[PDB]
Design a protein around this nucleic acid. Structure first.
Lengths: 48, 48, 132, 93, 147, 79, 57
RNA sequence: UUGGGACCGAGUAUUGCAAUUAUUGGUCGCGCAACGAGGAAUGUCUCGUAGGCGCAGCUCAUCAAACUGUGCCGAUUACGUCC
RNA sequence: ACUCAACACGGGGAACUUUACCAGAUCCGGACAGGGUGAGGAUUGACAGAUUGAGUGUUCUUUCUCGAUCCCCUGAAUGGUGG
């Protein structure tokens, strides 16, 4: 939605990190303000 | 609860959204959309 | 009614291949001679099949083909043929005045153009035309 | 595609094979003196596999191929045709 | 590239405000969309990479250590985003005060509304999909005859 | 030039791939053997060979309901 | 017979400006040459003589 | 106007595996379709040149108002200056 | 490709091919075998009928005919007028 606090550069750097660690296309799904988390996601990226 | 479940869910939703993006490549409003932006860009370039 | 050369339907049908290609224009003649050896192997059959089977009072079942390099003889008259413009099989029924032609001529391969206001770059002189 | 054996017998007593790069068949010595005839693609496949196994040494120039076949090549062949040899170059000189 | 629009965080300084006039020595005169009159400054990454004109709308910061010292322009909102902001729900267009509220300066000033996006074109993407593997009629000349 | 990535109109039955249709112990289904008479074994066949040079060796014909066929020289003696 | 008879046919007939292909590379754009039945202009002639050609004039 | 043809209908033969959106020739009709020395402005040229005229090669089943090359007929003015 | 150093220019006068682009179907040109396949193996090709634009075994039904590399699964390789 409209309301966000986070600055763009922040987001874009995390999004970058997704590309390289890509698995289930957590890449695409996160870019959709649409995210998953469980054990099968790596510790790093799920924290992000 | 895990494993296949959460992935079916997420995946399917990304599908549906990507679907609705395609339908809006049927392109009327989106067409004028592109038609504009492009014009502005060209104008700016010419000015510079 | 229809007169191809002052011939109704029954005379045309009666003509053998020789008597036929004599009667037709120069292209059609040139075509037939050069060809021989079938060169519409399926496009005869498919028509004459569904043609025969009809109980009349309505047209034959439609047949589809890509080909359009084949003549129109008085044999295939009355049929319903598909002809393919590169995305659509197009509907044509074969009249007695379509003899001495090809198939492709009745099937358009482009949309005719009708325009929609010229944009910038048309007119050399500059005004940056609002809004189209 | 069992013109294999013929091709391998053209190799042994030459050490060299050549073929055009073309998709339409032609004999890959242009004369062998045993008058074999093979396609083009079939030939190409044979030498391709054996190359990846290290048995061939490949050369391309223009629209063609020149095939030389190693010391290693000789080994593989002798086992496949079940035959010893004195050696390929000594017989030729 | 990236977003052209950010929103204020009410904590950690940062409040919307509007330029009034400009003053020498990189400083300018600046006024609050709730509070009273102020004087601003500018940061050295905008010292002539960005030009902040008069009546442009911007996002300040405020000093952490001591309030009511001076404030500074840390961002600029492009005019494209100003109209959008002002619309939604957010800031006043009269920038409460104006010079002052007790003199009610610059009266309506009736809303403008960017209601100009759609021109009555761009209707219906709900229509047909492809029909292929059908013989269908479709000969031109249509309309050409009404006799 | 330029390019894009997407192909899917799809959502039909697509083709299965052709896959060999197996007959097991093919020789014994052709050659028929008998009760033993005179200590000599009598060998008959349900498959008769085609008379062309190519098929002149051992190569048998076929048997369909309405036709007979030869898979070697692609021929029909029609029933 | 089937698919094989319907694959690579219409230019093992040999016709038009298809089925040319230069000797030097295999590129068939930019004109194979018919002029004295040489081929070189698709590996460019600026790159290669060794045919006995030189610019004297 | 018998100056020019643009468009347009019918017939025929050749090229090619395929000429339909007429491919190319070749004869009849269409000429009553333009256009009567051309505004502001603008192109490159000094002798076998400018201009006029035709042929071949190139591409290549077929089609050159293009490009590359060769030949024929063959001038006017200046041979100066820095605006 | 866009002032002079874009615009009868990319030898670019393209019917198919050429050809990038669009609608549809086909083929492995996936090397290298570590992992699976008894004499039938894994496998190749096809008349006829049907599907289909297709007297295209593409695919199915049917049966016949054949190297066992062809075949099945990951890794990897490859090709590309894609950037």
């Amino acid at each position: 939605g409209e309301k966000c606090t986070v600055e763009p550069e922040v987001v874009d750097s995390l999004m970058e990190d997704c590309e390289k660690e890509g698995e289930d296309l957590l890449l695409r799904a996160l870019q959709r303000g649409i995210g998953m988390h469980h054990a099968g996601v790596k510790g790093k990226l799920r924290a992000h | 609860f895990e494993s296949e479940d959460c992935g079916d869910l997420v995946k399917y939703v990304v599908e549906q959204l990507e679907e609705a993006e395609s339908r809006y490549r049927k392109t009327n409003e989106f067409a004028l959309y592109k038609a504009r932006i492009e014009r502005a860009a060209a104008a700016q370039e010419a000015r510079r | 009614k229809f007169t191809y050369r002052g011939l109704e339907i029954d005379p045309l049908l009666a003509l053998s291949e020789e008597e036929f290609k004599t009667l037709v224009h120069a292209r059609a003649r040139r075509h037939m001679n050069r060809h021989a050896n079938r060169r519409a192997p399926v496009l005869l059959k498919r028509l004459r099949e569904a043609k025969k089977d009809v109980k009349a009072g309505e047209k034959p079942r439609a047949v589809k083909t890509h080909l359009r390099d084949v003549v129109i003889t008085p044999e295939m008259v009355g049929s319903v043929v598909g002809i393919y413009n590169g995305r659509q099989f197009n509907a044509v029924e074969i009249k007695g005045e379509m003899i001495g032609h090809y198939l492709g001529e009745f099937s358009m391969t482009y949309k005719p153009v009708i325009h929609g206001r010229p944009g910038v770059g048309a007119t050399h002189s500059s005004r940056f035309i609002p809004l189209k | 595609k069992r013109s294999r054996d013929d091709v391998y017998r053209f190799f042994f007593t030459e050490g060299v094979i050549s073929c055009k790069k073309d998709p339409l068949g032609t004999w890959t010595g242009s004369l062998g003196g045993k008058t074999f005839t093979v396609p083009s693609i079939q030939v190409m496949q044979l030498m391709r596999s054996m190359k990846s196994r290290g048995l061939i040494k490949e050369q391309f120039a223009w629209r063609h191929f020149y095939w030389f076949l190693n010391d290693e090549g000789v080994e593989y062949l002798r086992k496949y045709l079940f035959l010893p040899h004195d050696a390929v170059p000594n017989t030729h000189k | 590239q990236k977003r052209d629009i950010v929103y204020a965080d009410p904590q950690e300084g940062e409040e919307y405000a509007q330029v009034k006039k400009a003053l020498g020595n990189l400083r300018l005169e600046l006024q609050l969309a709730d509070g009273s009159k102020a004087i601003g400054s500018i940061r050295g990454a905008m010292v002539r990479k960005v030009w902040i004109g008069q009546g442009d709308v911007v996002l300040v910061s405020k000093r952490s250590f001591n309030k009511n010292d001076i404030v500074d322009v840390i961002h600029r909102y492009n005019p494209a985003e100003v109209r959008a902001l002002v619309k939604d729900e957010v800031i006043p267009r009269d920038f409460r005060s104006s010079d002052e509220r007790d003199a009610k300066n610059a009266h309506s000033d009736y809303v403008f509304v960017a209601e100009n996006d759609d021109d009555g074109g761009a209707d219906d993407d709900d229509q047909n999909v492809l029909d292929r593997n059908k013989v269908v009629l479709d000969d031109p000349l249509a309309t050409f005859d009404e006799l | 030039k330029g390019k894009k990535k997407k192909k899917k109109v799809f959502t039909k039955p697509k083709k299965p791939i052709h896959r060999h249709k197996l007959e097991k112990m093919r020789a014994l289904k052709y050659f028929k053997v008998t009760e033993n008479d005179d200590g000599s074994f009598k060998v008959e066949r349900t498959r008769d060979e085609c008379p062309n040079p190519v098929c002149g060796a051992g190569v048998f014909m076929a048997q369909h309901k309405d036709r007979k066929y030869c898979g070697k020289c692609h021929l029909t003696y029609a029933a | 017979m089937g698919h094989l008879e319907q694959w690579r046919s219409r230019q093992k007939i040999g016709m038009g400006k298809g089925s040319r292909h230069c000797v030097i590379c295999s590129n068939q754009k930019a004109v194979i040459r018919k002029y004295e039945l040489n081929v070189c202009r698709q590996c460019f002639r600026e790159n290669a003589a060794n045919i006995g050609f030189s610019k004297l004039r």
